Amino acid sequence: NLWVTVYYGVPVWKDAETTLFCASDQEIHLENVTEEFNMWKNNMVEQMHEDIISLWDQSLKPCVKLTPLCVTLQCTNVTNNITDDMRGELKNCSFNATTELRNKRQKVYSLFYRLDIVPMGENSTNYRLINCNTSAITQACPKVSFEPIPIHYCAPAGFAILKCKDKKFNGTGPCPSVSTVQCTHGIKPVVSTQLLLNGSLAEEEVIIRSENITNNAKNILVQLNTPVQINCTRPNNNTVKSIRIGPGQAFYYTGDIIGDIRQAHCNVSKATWNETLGKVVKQLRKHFGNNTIIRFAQSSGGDLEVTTHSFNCGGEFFYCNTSGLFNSTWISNDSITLPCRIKQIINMWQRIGQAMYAPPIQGVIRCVSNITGLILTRDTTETFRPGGGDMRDNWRSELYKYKVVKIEPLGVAPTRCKR
Amino acid sequence: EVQLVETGGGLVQPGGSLKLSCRASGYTFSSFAMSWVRQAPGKGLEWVSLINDRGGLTFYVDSVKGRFTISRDNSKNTLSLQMHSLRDGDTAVYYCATGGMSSALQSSKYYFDFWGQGALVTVS
Amino acid sequence: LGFLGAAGSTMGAASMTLTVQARNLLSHWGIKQLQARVLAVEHYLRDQQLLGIWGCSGKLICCTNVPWNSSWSNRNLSEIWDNMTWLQWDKEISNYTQIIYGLLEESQNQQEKNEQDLLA
Amino acid sequence: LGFLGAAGSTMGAASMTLTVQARNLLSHWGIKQLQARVLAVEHYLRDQQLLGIWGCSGKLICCTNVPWNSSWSNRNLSEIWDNMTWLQWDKEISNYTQIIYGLLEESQNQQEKNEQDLLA
Amino acid sequence: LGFLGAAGSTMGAASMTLTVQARNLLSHWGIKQLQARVLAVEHYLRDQQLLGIWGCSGKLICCTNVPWNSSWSNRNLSEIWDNMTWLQWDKEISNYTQIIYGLLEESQNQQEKNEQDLLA
Ligand SMILES: *[C@@H]1O[C@H](CO)[C@@H](O[C@@H]2O[C@H](CO)[C@@H](O[C@@H]3O[C@H](CO)[C@@H](O)[C@H](O[C@H]4O[C@H](CO)[C@@H](O)[C@H](O)[C@@H]4O)[C@@H]3O)[C@H](O)[C@H]2NC(C)=O)[C@H](O)[C@H]1NC(C)=O
Ligand SMILES: *[C@@H]1O[C@H](CO)[C@@H](O[C@@H]2O[C@H](CO)[C@@H](O)[C@H](O)[C@H]2NC(C)=O)[C@H](O)[C@H]1NC(C)=O
Ligand SMILES: *[C@@H]1O[C@H](CO)[C@@H](O[C@@H]2O[C@H](CO)[C@@H](O)[C@H](O)[C@H]2NC(C)=O)[C@H](O)[C@H]1NC(C)=O
Ligand SMILES: *[C@@H]1O[C@H](CO)[C@@H](O[C@@H]2O[C@H](CO)[C@@H](O)[C@H](O)[C@H]2NC(C)=O)[C@H](O)[C@H]1NC(C)=O
Ligand SMILES: *[C@@H]1O[C@H](CO[C@@H]2O[C@@H](C)[C@@H](O)[C@@H](O)[C@@H]2O)[C@@H](O)[C@H](O)[C@H]1NC(C)=O
Ligand SMILES: *[C@@H]1O[C@H](CO[C@@H]2O[C@@H](C)[C@@H](O)[C@@H](O)[C@@H]2O)[C@@H](O)[C@H](O)[C@H]1NC(C)=O
Ligand SMILES: *[C@@H]1O[C@H](CO[C@@H]2O[C@@H](C)[C@@H](O)[C@@H](O)[C@@H]2O)[C@@H](O)[C@H](O)[C@H]1NC(C)=O
Ligand SMILES: *[C@@H]1O[C@H](CO[C@@H]2O[C@@H](C)[C@@H](O)[C@@H](O)[C@@H]2O)[C@@H](O)[C@H](O)[C@H]1NC(C)=O
Ligand SMILES: *[C@@H]1O[C@H](CO[C@@H]2O[C@@H](C)[C@@H](O)[C@@H](O)[C@@H]2O)[C@@H](O)[C@H](O)[C@H]1NC(C)=O
Ligand SMILES: *[C@@H]1O[C@H](CO[C@@H]2O[C@@H](C)[C@@H](O)[C@@H](O)[C@@H]2O)[C@@H](O)[C@H](O)[C@H]1NC(C)=O
Ligand SMILES: *[C@@H]1O[C@H](CO)[C@@H](O)[C@H](O)[C@H]1NC(C)=O
Ligand SMILES: *[C@@H]1O[C@H](CO)[C@@H](O)[C@H](O)[C@H]1NC(C)=O
Ligand SMILES: *[C@@H]1O[C@H](CO)[C@@H](O)[C@H](O)[C@H]1NC(C)=O
Ligand SMILES: *[C@@H]1O[C@H](CO)[C@@H](O)[C@H](O)[C@H]1NC(C)=O
Ligand SMILES: *[C@@H]1O[C@H](CO)[C@@H](O)[C@H](O)[C@H]1NC(C)=O
Ligand SMILES: *[C@@H]1O[C@H](CO)[C@@H](O)[C@H](O)[C@H]1NC(C)=O
Ligand SMILES: *[C@@H]1O[C@H](CO)[C@@H](O)[C@H](O)[C@H]1NC(C)=O
Ligand SMILES: *[C@@H]1O[C@H](CO)[C@@H](O)[C@H](O)[C@H]1NC(C)=O
Ligand SMILES: *[C@@H]1O[C@H](CO)[C@@H](O)[C@H](O)[C@H]1NC(C)=O
Ligand SMILES: *[C@@H]1O[C@H](CO)[C@@H](O)[C@H](O)[C@H]1NC(C)=O
Ligand SMILES: *[C@@H]1O[C@H](CO)[C@@H](O)[C@H](O)[C@H]1NC(C)=O
Ligand SMILES: *[C@@H]1O[C@H](CO)[C@@H](O)[C@H](O)[C@H]1NC(C)=O
Ligand SMILES: *[C@@H]1O[C@H](CO)[C@@H](O)[C@H](O)[C@H]1NC(C)=O
Ligand SMILES: *[C@@H]1O[C@H](CO)[C@@H](O)[C@H](O)[C@H]1NC(C)=O
Ligand SMILES: *[C@@H]1O[C@H](CO)[C@@H](O)[C@H](O)[C@H]1NC(C)=O
Ligand SMILES: *[C@@H]1O[C@H](CO)[C@@H](O)[C@H](O)[C@H]1NC(C)=O
Ligand SMILES: *[C@@H]1O[C@H](CO)[C@@H](O)[C@H](O)[C@H]1NC(C)=O
Ligand SMILES: *[C@@H]1O[C@H](CO)[C@@H](O)[C@H](O)[C@H]1NC(C)=O
Ligand SMILES: *[C@@H]1O[C@H](CO)[C@@H](O)[C@H](O)[C@H]1NC(C)=O
Ligand SMILES: *[C@@H]1O[C@H](CO)[C@@H](O)[C@H](O)[C@H]1NC(C)=O
Ligand SMILES: *[C@@H]1O[C@H](CO)[C@@H](O)[C@H](O)[C@H]1NC(C)=O
Structurally, how many domains does chain B consist of? Predict the structure, then answer.
C-alpha cells in the first residue's frame, strides 16, 4: 500500500535556546506561517542582559582604581551664588592624596555632590566617600564613551530567528504574519528606568503589554506610537582638573564652577505629554473598566535609583523627579520642568560589590531624547505609578517581536514508492 | 468538462513521418500522466506510449520503441507524438488519453480517465 | 524561494525545496561562540549518521522497505501531500518517530546481510 | 608522489593523485588554534555536502548529466587534459563555477524525483 | 544488547551489532572539554573519509575486490568467525592493516577510472 519515505531538508522547526552572536558597525516572508510568540519567556532577553553587563565590566578593567581616595575628607559649604534648590547639594572637600611617589602627599580640594559623600560620627566637617565601607570605586576611563551603540543579534547555523510583523501584536499568542530573518535589527542598549528612551515606536496605536494584566505584581510596558521629546540640561559651567595619584594614574574632578549654581532639570512639552496620557488611558480602559477612573501617581518609595528617572545625559548620570508627569486623574507653549540630581558614584546594575566613579565633564551639558514608552505598575479607581528598576524590561521592549527556533530538517511521510 | 482534441495528421507514405498533437482543456494538464492508445480499423485497442506529468519519463510498446517519440508541453497544454518510418501496420486511429500513471505522492491510476476522439493516421 | 519560504506551503510543494534548507545547516568571550559552532557540527553529523544507518546516505529523498502502519496515521495521500504542511505533519506523528526510526534501522541491517551473501 | 606534487603536472596526470590531496584535508592562548580546527572541519563538511547535493557522495571522480557550454570554455580535450594544469584551468573558468554548480544541483533534483516515481 | 556488549562474543555474532557501536561514536576551564569534542569529531571524520576512499561510503558491511593474502592470516572461516572475537583478531593482524588499507585504496582508484570510461 504505502511505504515510509525519508526526506531531508524539510522546512520544520522547534522552539529552542542557543547562544546568539554579535554583529555591529536577509528577510523571508513565510507566506502561510502562523507562529506562537511569548515575550517574557524569550531567552534572547536573558542573553542580552548578561552580554551588556559583561561588556560593561570589561571596559573598566584597564581604568584607574580609586583606592588612594578612601581618606577622610574635610567638607565645607561652597562659596558661590547657590540658589535655593541647590542649597546643600555641593560640598567643597579637602583631602591629602597620594602622588606618583610613595613618600609624597598633595593637598587637593574638589567639589562633590552631597549624594556621593557621607558624614562620619555625625561630624559636619569630616566626610568619607559613599562606597569606602562596601567597595573599591573604579574610575571610568575618560576616553571611553557611554553611548548606546546598536547591537544586532545573529543566529548560528542550524537555527533561525523568526520575527512577528503584526502591528497590533501585544507580545503573546499567535502571530499571523511571520518572517524569517538572519539577524535582528540594531538594538540600542539604552539604560534608563521609568521612561524608555530612544526605542522603537508602535506603528499604529499605543500598545500595553503585561505578562498578566490583572496581576498587580507585574509591570506594564507601554509602547507609544508617537515620541515625546524631552530636553535635559545641567546648566553649570564645570572646570575640570586632574591630579596624579599614582604611576601614570590620573584622577579627574570638578575644581570649580564658573558663575551661579543652578539645578539640573528636564523639560517635557505640557501639551504633548497630556495627549500621550490620554492615549494611554484609552488603551488601559480596554483591560480595566470603561466607566472607570484612571489615576496617575508618583513612585511610592525606595531609593533614588528607583523613585526617579535615571539616565545618562552626555556622560553624566541624572536622577529626575517625574511627579510632574504622573500627577492627574482621568474620570470617564508650556512645558513641565522636572528637577534632577546628579551623582558621580553609581552602581549601574542592581549589584552590591561594584561601584564606578564617573569623572566630570568639562563645560555645560545638554541632551535631547525621545520618550518611546513607559514602565508602569498598578496598585473603583485604578492607580498607576512609574516602575522600571529592572533593566531586563528595557530589553523586552525591543526583543518582544523575535523568537529563536531550531531547524529540524529530517522527517518521514508515507508514499507509494518502495525500495 | 474535460476535453482532449487531436489535431494531428492524415495520409502519409510508408517509411515517412507524421506528427500528432492533442490540445487539452478543463483540467490541470500538469497534474496528469498521458498516453496514446491506438485502434486499427478492424481491431481493438492497443497501448502505444506513456508520458509522465512532468515530461521526464517515457515508456513505449516494443513495436514502436525505436520509432516513436512521446512528448509534452505543460505551458501550452499540449501532448504530442512524433512517428517515424511509418509501417503499413501503423494505420490506426490514435487516441489522446489521460491516465496510465501517477507520481508516488498521488493515488495511483493504472487506467485511462479521459479520451479524445482520435486522429486517423493512414499509411499507404 | 529562500530559506523556510515553503514552510507554509503543502508537503508536496515544500518537498521541492529540500536543497534550500540543507544548505543552511552549515555556516572567556568567544568561547560560547565556539561551543555553538562545535555543537552545530555535532548535530549535523548525527543526522547524517542516521541517514547512513538507514541506507539513505547521499540523498535528500530516500525510499525504504518499511511499510506504513495506519496506527501512525490513517490519512490518505491527498490529505497528506495536498494539505497538512510539514509543520502540521510533524506534530501529528511526533509520538511515532522513534518506532519508525527503529524499524528503518532494522530493515537496513537485514538488507546489508542479504546482499553480502548474494555477492558470495 | 606527495601532497601537491602533481600541481605542476597536466590535468590528466594530476587526476590520478586525488587521494593524495583528499587525505591531507583532515588533520586566551590556544583559542585561535581551536578556531582554526573548527573552521577546517566546517570547510570540509561544506564541500562534502555540496558533492552530496550534486549526487557525487562517496566518490572522487563523478560523471553527471550536465552538458558543457562552450561559452564556459571552447578548448578541446587535448588542450585541457594534455596541457592546462589544474591551476591554469581553475583561473580560466573561475567566472563560471557558480553557473555550473547551480546547474549540477538542478539536475540532481530532477533525477531524484524521476527515480522515486519509477520505484512507484 | 548495549554498547560493547558483544565485545566478548565471536566475530560472527558481534558483526550483528555494528549500529550499536556506530551510534556511540558521536555525543581556562572548559577549553580542554572543547578540545576533546573537536578531536572526537576529527577522529570520526577521518574514519568516514577513509571508508569513502575505499568505496564503502554509507555502509557498515562492505565487500571489496582485494583478495586475502594468507601471509596476513592463514586461519579458515570457522577459526575466524566462530572463534577469535574481534579483540583477538585485531591483535593477530595489527601488523598488516596498513598494507591492507593501501591495497583497498589502490583498488578503488582503478575501479573509478574503469567506470568513467564505460560511461564514455
Ligand atoms: C537619544 O538619541 C540622541 C540622538 O542620537 C542622543 O543625542 C546625542 O548625544 C551625543 C552624546 O552626548 C552627542 O554627541 C556629542 O556632541 C558634542 C557636541 O558637538 C561633542 O562635543 C561630543 O564629542 C566629545 O565627547 C565624545 C564622548 O562622548 C568624545 O569621543 C569626542 O572626542 C569629544 O570629546 C559628542 O560628539 C550628539 O550630538 C547628540 N545628538 C543630538 C542630535 O543632539 C541622546 O543622548 C540619546 N539619549 C539617551 C538617553 O541615550
Ligand atoms: C525649560 O523651561 C524653562 C522655563 O520654565 C526655561 O527657562 C528659561 O530659559 C531662558 C534662556 O533660554 C531664560 O531667558 C528664561 O528667563 C528662563 N525662564 C525661567 C522661568 O527660568 C529652560 O531654559 C528650559 N530648558 C532646558 C532643558 O534647557
Ligand atoms: C574651596 O575652598 C578653597 C580654599 O580652601 C578655595 O580656594 C581659595 O580661594 C581664595 C579666593 O577666594 C584664594 O585666595 C586662595 O588662594 C584659594 N586657595 C587654594 C588652596 O587654592 C576654593 O575656591 C573653594 N572652591 C569653590 C568651588 O568655591
Ligand atoms: C518629587 O517631588 C515631590 C514634591 O513635588 C515629593 O513629594 C513629597 O514627599 C513627601 C515625603 O518625603 C510628602 O510628605 C509630601 O506631601 C510630598 N509632596 C506632594 C506635593 O505630594 C517627592 O518625594 C519627590 N520625589 C523624589 C524621588 O525626590
Ligand atoms: C501496527 O501497530 C499496531 C498497534 O501497535 C501499537 O500501537 C502503535 C500506535 C504503537 O504505539 C505501537 O508501539 C503499539 O504496539 C500493531 O498491533 C500492528 O501489528 C502494527 N503493524 C505491523 C507492525 O505490522
Ligand atoms: C481521501 O480522503 C478524502 C477525505 O476523507 C474524509 O475526511 C478525512 C479527514 C477522514 O475523516 C476520512 O475518514 C473521511 O472519509 C476523501 O474525500 C477522498 O475521496 C479520499 N481519496 C481517495 C483516493 O480515497
Ligand atoms: C550557453 O551560454 C549561452 C550564453 O549564456 C551567457 O553567457 C555565459 C558565458 C554566461 O555568462 C551566462 O550566464 C549567459 O547567459 C546561452 O545563450 C546558451 O543558451 C547556453 N547553453 C545552454 C544553457 O544550452
Ligand atoms: C584540438 O585543438 C588543437 C589546437 O587548435 C588550435 O589552437 C587552439 C588554441 C584554438 O585557437 C583553436 O581554434 C585552433 O584551431 C588542434 O591542432 C587539434 O587538431 C584539435 N584536435 C581535435 C581532435 O580536433
Ligand atoms: C602475499 O605476501 C607475500 C609476502 O609478502 C611479504 O610478507 C608479508 C607478510 C608482508 O610483510 C609484505 O609486505 C611482504 O612483502 C608476497 O610475496 C605475495 O606476493 C603476496 N601476495 C600477493 C600480493 O599476491
Ligand atoms: C578449519 O580448521 C580446523 C582446524 O585446523 C587445525 O588447527 C588450526 C589452528 C591450524 O593449526 C590448522 O593447520 C590445523 O589443521 C579444521 O579442523 C577444519 O576441518 C577446517 N575446516 C575446513 C572446511 O577446512
Ligand atoms: C552673588 O550675589 C550677590 C548678591 O546679589 C552679588 O552682590 C554678587 O555680585 C554675586 N556674585 C557674582 C560673582 O556676581
Ligand atoms: C551649610 O549648608 C547647610 C545646608 O545643607 C546649612 O544648614 C548650614 O547652616 C550651612 N552652614 C554655613 C556655615 O553656612
Ligand atoms: C591633611 O594633612 C594635614 C597635615 O599635613 C592635616 O592637618 C589635615 O587635617 C589633613 N586633611 C584631612 C582631610 O585629613
Ligand atoms: C555603610 O554605612 C552606611 C551608613 O552610612 C550603611 O547604611 C551601610 O549598610 C554600610 N555598608 C556596609 C557594607 O556595612
Ligand atoms: C495579549 O493578547 C492575548 C491574545 O489575544 C490575550 O489573551 C492577552 O490577555 C493580551 N494581554 C494584554 C496585556 O493585552
Ligand atoms: C493572573 O493573575 C490572577 C490574579 O489577578 C490569577 O488569579 C490568575 O491565575 C493568573 N493567571 C495566570 C495564567 O497566571
Ligand atoms: C565656560 O567656560 C569656558 C572657559 O573654560 C568659556 O570659554 C565658555 O564660553 C563658558 N561657557 C558658558 C556657558 O559660560
Ligand atoms: C527641545 O529643544 C528643541 C530644539 O532642539 C525645541 O524645538 C523644543 O521645543 C524643546 N522642547 C521642550 C519641551 O522645551
Ligand atoms: C488634559 O486632558 C483633560 C481631558 O480632556 C483636560 O480636562 C485637561 O485640561 C488637559 N490638560 C492640559 C494641560 O491640556
Ligand atoms: C468603551 O468605550 C468606547 C468609546 O470610547 C467604545 O467604542 C467601546 O465599544 C466601549 N466598550 C465597551 C465594552 O463598552
Ligand atoms: C499635583 O497637582 C496639584 C494641583 O492640581 C498640586 O497642588 C500637587 O502638589 C501636585 N502633586 C505633586 C506630587 O506634584
Ligand atoms: C524622535 O523621533 C523622530 C521620528 O522618528 C526622529 O526623526 C528623531 O530623530 C527622534 N529623536 C531622537 C533624539 O532620536
Ligand atoms: C498560501 O495559501 C494560498 C491559498 O490561500 C496559496 O495560493 C499560496 O501559494 C500559499 N503560500 C505558500 C508559500 O505556499
Ligand atoms: C486536501 O485533502 C483532500 C482529501 O482529503 C484532497 O481532495 C485535496 O486534494 C487536498 N488539497 C486541496 C487542494 O484541498
Ligand atoms: C500522541 O501522544 C499524546 C500523549 O503524549 C496523546 O495525547 C495523543 O493522543 C497522541 N496522538 C497523536 C497526536 O498522534
Ligand atoms: C614538468 O615538465 C616536464 C617536461 O618539460 C615533464 O617531463 C615533467 O614530468 C613535468 N613535471 C610534473 C610534476 O609533471
Ligand atoms: C596540448 O594540446 C594539443 C592540442 O592543442 C595536443 O595536441 C597535445 O596533445 C597537448 N599536449 C601536448 C603533449 O603538448
Ligand atoms: C572573466 O571575468 C573577467 C571579469 O571579472 C573578464 O575580464 C574575463 O574576460 C572573463 N573571462 C575569462 C577569463 O574566462
Ligand atoms: C560467553 O561464552 C558462552 C559459552 O561459554 C556463550 O554461551 C555466551 O553467549 C558468550 N557471551 C557472549 C557475550 O557472547
Ligand atoms: C572454532 O574453530 C573450529 C575450526 O578451527 C570450528 O570447527 C568451530 O566451528 C569454531 N567454533 C566453535 C563453535 O568452537
Ligand atoms: C607482528 O609483528 C611483531 C613485531 O612487531 C612480530 O613479533 C610478530 O611475530 C608479528 N606477527 C603477528 C602477531 O602477526
Answer: 1
Across the interface, do B107 and C12 touch by the CB < 8 Å criterion? no
Question: Which grid coordinates are listed for C20?
Answer: 534550500
Grid cell 530559506 is found at C3
The alpha carbon of B90 and the centre of ligand 20 are apart by a number of angstroms equal to 81
Distances (CA, A) of E57 to C22, C107, E45: 20, 18, 12
Asked if E41 lies within 8 A of C46 by C-beta distance, the reply is no
How many whole angstroms separate alpha carbon A117 and alpha carbon A122?
A: 12
| Structure determination method | cryo-EM
Q: Does residue E78 have its Cβ closer than 6 Å to ligand 30?
A: yes
Contacts of C38 in chain E (CB under 8 A): 34, 37-38, 41
Question: Are E and D neighbours with ≥3 CB pairs closer than 8 A?
Answer: yes
> Would the CB of D95 count as within 6 Å of ligand 28?
yes
Q: Which domain holds residue D44?
A: 1-120
Q: Whose CA is nearest to atom 18 of ligand 5?
A: C69
CA distance C29 to E21: 36
Whole-angstrom distance, CA of residue B37 vs CA of residue B44: 10
Resolution in A: 2.7
CATH number for B45: 2.60.40.10
Alpha helices in chain C (DSSP H): 11-14, 18-22, 31-53, 77-81, 86-93, 97-116
CA distance A167 to A145: 35
Cβ–Cβ < 8 Å for A127, A93: yes
Q: How many structural domains compose chain D?
A: 1
D partners (3+ CB pairs within 8 A) are A, B, C, E
**A419 interface with B at CB cutoff 8 Å:** no
Nearest CB to B106; choose among C11, C15, C77: C77
CA separation, residue D116 to residues A177, A364, B13, B105, C69 (Å): 35, 77, 41, 10, 20
Q: For residues B104 and D117, is the Cβ–Cβ distance under 8 A? A: yes
Interface test with E, best of D26, D35, D77 (most E CBs within 10 A): D26
Question: By residue range, what is the domain housing residue B40?
Answer: 3-123
Query: Which of C49, C64, C105 is most worth mutating to test chain A (most A CB atoms within 10 A of its CB)?
Result: C64
Residue by residue, what is the 3-state secondary structure of chain A? CCEEEEEECCCCEEECCCCCEEECCCEECCCCCCEEEECCCCHHHHHHHHHHHHHHHHHCCCCCECCCCCCCEEEEECCCCECHHHCCCEEEEEEEEECCCCCCEEEEEEEEEHHHEEECCCCCCEEEECCCCCCCEEECCCCCCCCCCCEEEECCCCEEEEEECCCCCCCEEEECCEEEECECCCECCCCCCCEEECCCCCCCCCEEEECCCCCCCCCEEEEEEEEEEEEEEEEEEEEEEEEEEECCEEEEEEEEEECCECCEEEEEEHHHHHHHHHHHHHHHCCCCCCCCEEEECCCCCCCHHHHCEEEEECCEEEEECCCCCCCEEEECCCEEEEEEEEECEECCCCCCCCEEECCCCCEEEEEEEEEEEEEEEECCCEEEEECCCCCHHHHHHHHCCEEEEEECCEEEEEECCCC
B vs C contact (3+ beta-carbon pairs below 8 A): yes
Q: Which ligand is nearest to the CA of E5?
A: 29
Which residues of C are less than 8 Å from A31 in CB distance? 5, 8-9
Residue B51 in 3-state DSSP? Answer: strand
Q: Find, in chain B, the residue whose alpha carbon is nearest to that of A414.
A: B105
Q: Do chains D and A touch (3 or more CB pairs under 8 A)?
A: yes
Indicate yes or no: CB of E49 within 8 angstroms of CB of D37.
no
Nine-digit cell at B81? 507524438
B107 to chain A, minimum CA–CA distance in Å? 8
Burial class for D25, CB neighbours closer than 10 Å (0-12, 13-18, 19+):
middle
